[PDB]
């Protein structure tokens, strides 16, 4: 009849590599957060008053705010070093360019990761945000409009860290 | 009501600032606060009738005089640059009544004033791509390079501010964060239909309000006095 | 005593409700006022409660007064555009010729997009920088901050004519706009 | 690989 | 705010239904989920699984907690039930359309809430439950959801394909078509 949620996040945060790590954790029910932990702040801190019994009573526990301050190391730290690395960080994977036309499209798709730099020298062209296929590859569309026998295009030169050289497709 | 003067102020470490607050509601009570963006308004003096001051949250720095029930001034003997902030003059009928805010008045304290410089005002006219899918024109102004942070932007239509399809940046940017005391950047959209943006007799300005020196204050450097001004640039419609 | 106002920041979808919540320490407290600053200007009172009621609802406001938990709530429902601001709470007693006001909470009501369409475009130079445009993006679409130096990325922003923007310019003669916006 | 654990809420 | 983001114990659940998950995200994507029902884990690429090691019963742990946080909110908000949402799909291939050969279909489903959903992939209003896969549950900054589902295809005169969403938040379900060709 009626519906009620609760959701749990666990939240790890990295710039330049595990140089600064910074964990933050949210119990949050119906879209509301009400108590979060925050390793700038270093202990639980109520978001909405909902969240004022959790932390005030988790604060008071030295045991939980020395497991979840332990957490940055022993969970942020630890996945990025071993399993991130092993694994998400290595991944790369090559794109794949095709020019069509129907307004010429070029499509760069199935690549990873994020960073790439796709262009044509000619301006006036219009490009999607980056499309996150949820299968560990992205893809982007970049569409010029094109008129009749305006010479050969040039290229679609596409730029990413997978490749060495870029690929510059000619039309 | 109430009224505070002056509006904006920029000075160096060490001035004499003199903050001014006339209220004409017969309130006995007027208040000096300071607004951060570090969010909150902290308190720092106050008074409760003519010939009395009291010392609010943060007195430290600053000291009020309150001559006459109309008028509360709050004076920095040696102006810091932690006293850079949004400072706002209230004033009430009784403690536990409304409070009558002024305007709020914008702060620049600097520690060297010859690091002071306009804003460089540049309008950019719409993208192709986005006039021939959108069938709408978004113009972009860029206020660059601009010390310290006090700016005001605005847009101008045919002689007329215009404020439906504008949007500027709430706050303007560091242009080297890692820096300190670094120049500003300002970025600010207006859009309009792709029709409006065809039509050459629609006449679109970005202007660009600078506060920085004022008239009693001398420059005498190798450029040009970055006094206080208006900076604006801008641009034609267009039917190709 | 002091009063703590514990949303600091409230992000709300638009037509959905929002409420901000306070506390006081001084039981003697009797006025409890609301002041909603909007963006570049200074606070207003919009609403107050004192000590001799519970809920008091005017003017599209509710607010109400819990005077044994020493708590009290401003209640904003079907919330519009135009309830973005910071919301300040306070609390007053006899014995104190000031208010003791909350830290604010910023309001954030998100307009809908009936139909987003994202996409980047390039402007005209019109004679020194490259300046892209990243536009129609849907609410939840969070524009990242560039971490590529020289090269400057603007917050979102939304303007009603209601379409979401983001500019991002640079000076660098490799910069180009397919992926400049790296979200 | 390393998870963040669930704190029980306060019970009353 | 930092060049990576990992999202280690997320966990999910609701009352009425008796349902959660547990899944663990990095920048993004899924790295796995939990499938309650078999216990085991199910990691989104193969390749990963091989290499990292979670045992299942960590994500069942934080689920039997938030199951009884649940029961312990619900009564700490005077029982605010949850808010249904309206979802927006949208239809896009994996790779570039090319007549007559094999691509994937993908709608995306965006701010799912509660993550109750029902996604359908019909071919010219015709049940296809062959070569159709779904992410799980994935999460938003907002504590909404959005969910991905797949379809193989090949493009060929105008099959007419929609992508069919059943919501509670929805009265009458969304249907998004794509063709080409
Ligand atoms: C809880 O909700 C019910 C129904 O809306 C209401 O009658 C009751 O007063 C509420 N209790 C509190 C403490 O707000
Ligand atoms: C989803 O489909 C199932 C059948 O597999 C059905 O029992 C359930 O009621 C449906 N839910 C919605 C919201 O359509």
């Known amino acids: 009849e009626r519906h009620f949620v609760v959701q749990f996040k666990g939240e790890c945060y990295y710039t330049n590599g595990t140089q600064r790590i910074r964990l933050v954790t949210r119990y949050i029910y119906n879209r509301e957060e009400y108590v979060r932990y925050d390793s700038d702040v270093g202990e639980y801190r109520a978001v909405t008053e909902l969240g004022r019994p959790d932390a005030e009573y988790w604060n008071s526990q030295p045991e939980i705010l020395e497991r979840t301050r332990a957490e940055v190391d022993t969970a942020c730290r630890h996945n990025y070093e071993g399993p991130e690395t092993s694994t998400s960080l290595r991944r790369l994977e090559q794109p794949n360019v095709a020019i069509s036309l129907s307004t010429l499209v070029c499509s760069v798709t199935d690549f990873y990761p994020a960073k790439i730099k796709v262009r044509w020298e000619t301006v006036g062209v219009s490009s999607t945000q980056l499309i996150r296929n949820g299968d560990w590859t992205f893809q982007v569309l970049v569409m010029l409009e094109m008129t009749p026998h305006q010479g050969e295009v040039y290229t679609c030169h596409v730029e990413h860290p997978s490749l060495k050289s870029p690929i510059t497709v000619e039309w | 009501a109430v009224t505070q003067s002056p509006r904006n102020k920029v000075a160096v470490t060490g001035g004499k600032v003199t903050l001014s607050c006339n209220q004409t509601?017969?309130?006995?009570?007027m208040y000096w606060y300071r607004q951060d963006t570090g969010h909150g308004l902290r308190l720092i003096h106050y008074s409760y009738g003519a010939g009395s001051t009291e010392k609010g949250d943060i007195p430290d720095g600053y000291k009020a005089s309150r001559p006459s029930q109309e008028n509360f001034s709050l004076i920095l003997e040696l102006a810091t640059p932690s006293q850079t902030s949004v400072y706002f003059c209230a004033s009430g009928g009784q403690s536990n009544e409304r409070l009558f805010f002024g305007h709020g008045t914008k702060l620049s304290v600097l520690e060297d004033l010859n690091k002071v410089f306009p804003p460089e005002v540049a309008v950019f006219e719409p993208s192709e791509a986005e006039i021939s899918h959108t069938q709408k024109a978004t113009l972009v102004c860029l206020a660059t390079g601009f010390f310290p942070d006090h700016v005001e932007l605005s847009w101008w239509v045919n002689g007329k501010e215009v404020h439906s399809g504008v949007c500027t940046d709430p706050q303007p940017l560091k242009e080297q964060p890692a820096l300190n005391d670094s120049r500003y950047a300002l970025s600010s959209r207006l859009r309009v239909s792709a029709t409006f943006w065809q039509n050459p007799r629609n006449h679109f300005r970005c202007q660009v309000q600078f506060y920085g020196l004022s008239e009693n204050d001398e420059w005498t450097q190798d450029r040009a006095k970055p006094v206080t001004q208006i900076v604006s640039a801008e641009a034609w419609g267009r039917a190709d | 005593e002091q009063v703590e106002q514990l949303p600091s920041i409230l992000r709300v979808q638009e037509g959905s409700s929002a409420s901000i919540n306070c506390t006081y320490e001084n039981s003697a407290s009797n006025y409890f006022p609301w002041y909603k600053q909007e963006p570049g200007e200074n606070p207003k009172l919009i609403i107050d409660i004192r000590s001799n009621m519970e809920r008091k609802q005017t003017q599209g406001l509710i607010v109400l007064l819990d005077k044994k938990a020493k708590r009290f709530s401003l209640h904003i429902t079907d919330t519009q555009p135009g309830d973005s601001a910071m919301y300040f709470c306070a609390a007053s007693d006899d014995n104190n010729n000031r208010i003791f006001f909350g830290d604010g909470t910023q309001l954030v009501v998100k307009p809908n997009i009936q139909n987003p369409d994202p996409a980047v475009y390039q402007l005209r130079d019109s004679k020194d920088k490259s300046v892209c445009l990243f536009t129609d993006f849907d609410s939840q679409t969070n524009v990242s901050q560039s971490k590529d130096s020289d090269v400057y990325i603007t917050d979102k922003c939304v303007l009603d004519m209601k379409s979401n923007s983001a500019v991002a310019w640079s000076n660098k003669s490799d910069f180009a706009c397919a992926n400049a916006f790296n979200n | 690989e390393g998870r963040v654990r669930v704190n029980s809420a306060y019970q009353s | 705010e930092a060049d990576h983001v990992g999202f280690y114990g997320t966990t999910v659940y609701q009352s009425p239904g008796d349902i959660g998950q547990y899944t663990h995200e990095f920048d993004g994507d899924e790295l796995f989920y939990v499938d309650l029902d078999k216990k085991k884990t199910v990691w989104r690429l193969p390749e990963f699984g091989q290499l990292i090691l979670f045992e299942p019963q960590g994500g069942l742990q934080n689920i039997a907690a938030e199951k009884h946080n649940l029961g312990i909110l619900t009564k700490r908000s005077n029982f605010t039930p949850a808010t249904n949402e309206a979802p927006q799909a949208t239809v896009f291939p994996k790779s570039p359309v090319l007549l007559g050969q094999p691509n994937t279909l993908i709608c995306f489903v965006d701010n799912i809430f509660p993550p109750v959903i029902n996604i359908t992939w019909l071919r010219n209003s015709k049940s296809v439950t062959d070569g159709v896969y779904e992410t799980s549950f994935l999460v938003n900054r907002d504590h909404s959801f959005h969910k991905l589902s797949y379809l193989t295809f090949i493009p060929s005169d105008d099959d007419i394909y929609d992508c069919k969403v059943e919501h509670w938040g929805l009265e009458e379900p969304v249907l998004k078509h794509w063709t080409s060709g």
């Open positions: 509601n017969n309130h006995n009570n």
